[PDB]
Structure formats: C-alpha cells, structure tokens
Design an enzyme around this catalytic site. Sequence first.
Site, mmCIF file in Angstrom:
data_model
loop_
_atom_site.group_PDB
_atom_site.id
_atom_site.type_symbol
_atom_site.label_atom_id
_atom_site.label_comp_id
_atom_site.label_asym_id
_atom_site.label_seq_id
_atom_site.Cartn_x
_atom_site.Cartn_y
_atom_site.Cartn_z
ATOM 1 N N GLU A 11 0.774 -1.224 0.000
ATOM 2 C CA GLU A 11 0.000 0.000 0.000
ATOM 3 C C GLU A 11 0.818 1.292 0.000
ATOM 4 O OE1 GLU A 11 -3.138 0.090 -0.488
ATOM 5 O OE2 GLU A 11 -3.851 -1.861 0.101
ATOM 6 N N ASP A 20 -6.303 6.705 -4.822
ATOM 7 C CA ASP A 20 -5.771 5.396 -4.993
ATOM 8 C C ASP A 20 -5.870 4.899 -6.461
ATOM 9 O OD1 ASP A 20 -8.509 4.557 -5.512
ATOM 10 O OD2 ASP A 20 -8.535 3.348 -3.742
#
EC number: 3.2.1.17
Length: 162
Positions: A11, A20
Amino acid sequence: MNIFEMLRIDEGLRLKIYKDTEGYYTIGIGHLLTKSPSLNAAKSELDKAIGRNTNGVITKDEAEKLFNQDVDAAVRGILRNAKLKPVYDSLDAVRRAAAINMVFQMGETGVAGFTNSLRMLQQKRWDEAAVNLAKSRWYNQTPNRAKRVITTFRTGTWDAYK
Ligand SMILES: [Cl-]
Ligand SMILES: [Cl-]
Ligand SMILES: [Kr]
Ligand SMILES: [Kr]
Ligand SMILES: [Kr]
C-alpha cells in the site's frame, strides 16, 4: 515478515490525501477516506477519523494508528463473516496473512464473492486456487500486487515479498 509489513509494502505510506488506483481519496497506508469525488468530503472524513482539523495532512504516527485500526477491523470482518471464517480458520499463518491482505484491499464482501476460490483454498488445492484467483477483475487491475498475494496462497511462504 508479517501482515503489517506485508501491507505496508503493497500500500505504501503517503502523508497527504491522494487518490488510490481506483481514483478514490485515500491517505496513509491505504486508508480509504471516501468514494466521493469531492475533496472536501475527503477532508471531512479525514478530520473525523483523526479527531482534529488536519487540513489534509497527517503525521506518521497518525497514519500508523489508522493502519492498526484497519488491520484489526479487517481481521474482525473475516471472523464475523460466515463464508470467510471457515476458510481462514483452515489456513496456516502465512496464508491467513494473504487473506487479510485481500480483505483490506477489497472488503469482506468483495472477498466473500470468490466462492470458487474460497472452496479450493479450503480444500488445500493451492495451484488450482491460484489459477482461479487470477481470473478476476482484481488481478487484471492490480496485477503485480495480485501476483504477490496469489503466490503467497500458492506456496505458503513469504517469497514474493522477499
Ligand atoms: Cl476511521
Ligand atoms: Cl499492482
Ligand atoms: Kr478467507
Ligand atoms: Kr480469502
Ligand atoms: Kr479468496
């Protein structure tokens, strides 16, 4: 290696709000703030999550705090889910970290939808499950990360992260 280090690799860590892979507002270690296209909404949710007026920026510690809460929630989600719990309980420790990763990424719901793969994992048919897992939008959209998680279920080792 462990679940924290694993997700920290997949991540990353960003101290300012970012979008994202799906274009949604996120911060920290993959903490999704909102699916809304409004930055202000994102800023609202962030302040509420942190407990102060952050102005879209957080510290390292605050990021780590959200992450711990997120990992804990992911585990609890699995344990509470009737389609997931049995699978997860049948797995060894490494493979369990792979399952937590998937849940953290796509939500319990999402994961609970991999019916066929869930069954193969439960039967311990690793190669077969790995092939089925790859037949998904998840794999086509984030193939490098998907490959790492899939290899983890396949082998039961941390080699893909070493
Ligand atoms: Cl929160
Ligand atoms: Cl990826
Ligand atoms: Kr699972
Ligand atoms: Kr899973
Ligand atoms: Kr799965």
